Amino acid sequence: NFKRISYAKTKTRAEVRGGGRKPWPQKGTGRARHGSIRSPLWRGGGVAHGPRGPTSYYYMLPMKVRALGLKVALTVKLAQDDLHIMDSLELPTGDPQYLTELAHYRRWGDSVLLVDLTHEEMPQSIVEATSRLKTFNLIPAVGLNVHSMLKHQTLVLTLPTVAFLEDKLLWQDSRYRPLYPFSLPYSDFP
Amino acid sequence: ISRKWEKKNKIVYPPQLPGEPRRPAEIYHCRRQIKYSKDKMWYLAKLIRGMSIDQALAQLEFNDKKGAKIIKEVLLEAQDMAVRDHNVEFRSNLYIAESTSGRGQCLKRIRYHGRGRFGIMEKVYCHYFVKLVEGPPPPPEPPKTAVAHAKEYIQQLRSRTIVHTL
């Protein structure tokens, strides 16, 4: 929801073209009194309470909550035997057929999310294999998130990746309240 | 719009077994978009409802209404096509089974009134529908006799039960 921008907008009675003048006198005719042809009651009128403009749905959960989310997801993956650890995401061949049949044999599931430590130093074999595939998805460690983990049945982590995750997530516990954003230099942080 | 009445003549029944009564021929025919009120047309349709073809044609011939000649034309067309296409033996051996008027598509016009004010005039159109059935016209239902009434009343008395009891 945080990224969501709704682009739905409707014209208010003001915004609808015309409708300046009073359609008929108030008292003279046997008709109901109206003062514009563009009121919500009229056909082709403005809407009373419709969507207004681009609307933003942006909000931030506390940083600690979001980190706890990640920890919880990893815990649940391990508990339900859906987490697998790899020394490296190295394949003998770049054939996606190989990867699918491997996963079928290992009884992983329909969908596998593979996580490498870094994007640049990703092996070419796994990149080639995963690019073609739809259910198999390759992300760097920085790209890990709760939605992806829940969407995919099987989570595959590298040993570099697991060490990396532990460091980053455990840092959230046993940290001070920030004086200023962590992007700015600290003594011990980067 | 719907035009189901036309499609009714397109029905084909399977061949009859030798040990079966002969099926009377049915003919469906209509005139669409008659410039005439359906309400006015109704009276003429009602008039010829039970009648034979010749009786109906006679009555229509000597009627003063505009719609009478239109129904006469439709009846004649139906009689012709009955003999030609639907394998009716005799043109006389037909009677009106169904005779109906329906509303047509209509046009709105303006009727000017004697101030700035006005009215909306509607140009009426109607459909006339007819179904002809081969055979003599069925005899009219006889008026209820005193004996029939008596019998019905006795039946009512005999039918009655002790109510709200064991």
């Binding site: 008929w24 006198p25 008292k27 003279g28 005719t29 | 598509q105 046009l107 709105k108 016009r109 303006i110 101030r115 700035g116 004010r117 006005f118 909306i120």
Partner: peptide, 19 residues
């Protein structure tokens, strides 16, 4: 004192069968 009559748009009564 007096209210003027209102006329309907002409197109409404000028409609014809589509052929």
């Amino acid at each position: 004192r007096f209210t003027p009559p209102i006329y309907q748009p002409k197109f409404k009564t000028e409609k014809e069968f589509m052929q």
